[PDB]
Structure 1
C-alpha cells in the first residue's frame, strides 16, 4: 500500500524549489513579555529544516 504522509508534518513544513523543507520557529505563541523585540523579529521569520532532521524525517513527507 501507498506510504502515508505524516499529516502533522504536512501542516507544518513547506517544500522549497531546491527540495529543502521550510519551517516556522517554535517560541511564537504567548510568553512574549519574556522575549526581547529583537528575539521576536527573528522568531517571526521562517527557518529551514536542519540536515540531521531532514535525514530523519524526509520519508514522512515524501509527497
Structure 2
C-alpha cells in the first residue's frame, strides 16, 4: 500500500495518534470574515471522530 500524497502534506500525526490539521477558509476573501473569525481559524485543529477512521487507513 502507498500513502496518499494528498493525505500527507495536509495531516500531521502526534504522540497519541491524533491527526493535526489546518482550518479552511484562510486563503482569500479576507474582508468577508470578521477578525474574530480570522483569529479563530488561524489556530490548528484535529480531525473529528467521523473522519479519524477514514484518515487512519489513508496515512
- TM-score (structure 2 length as normaliser): 0.94
What's the counterpart of residue 30 of structure 1? 28
Task: Give the Cα–Cα distance (whole angstroms) in 1 for the partners of residues 56 and 17 of structure 2.
Answer: 10
CA RMSD of aligned residues (A): 0.7
Give the helix-richer structure, 1 or 2: 1
Count of residues paired in the alignment = 59
- TM-score (structure 1 length as normaliser): 0.89
- 5+ residue gaps in structure 1? none
1:57, CA displacement in angstroms?
A: 2.0
What's the counterpart of residue 11 of structure 1? 9
Moved over 6 A (4+): none
**Residue 52 of structure 1, aligned match among 44, 50, 53:** 50
Task: Give the Cα–Cα distance (whole angstroms) in 2 for the partners of residues 17 and 57 of structure 1.
Answer: 16
- 5+ residue gaps in structure 2? none
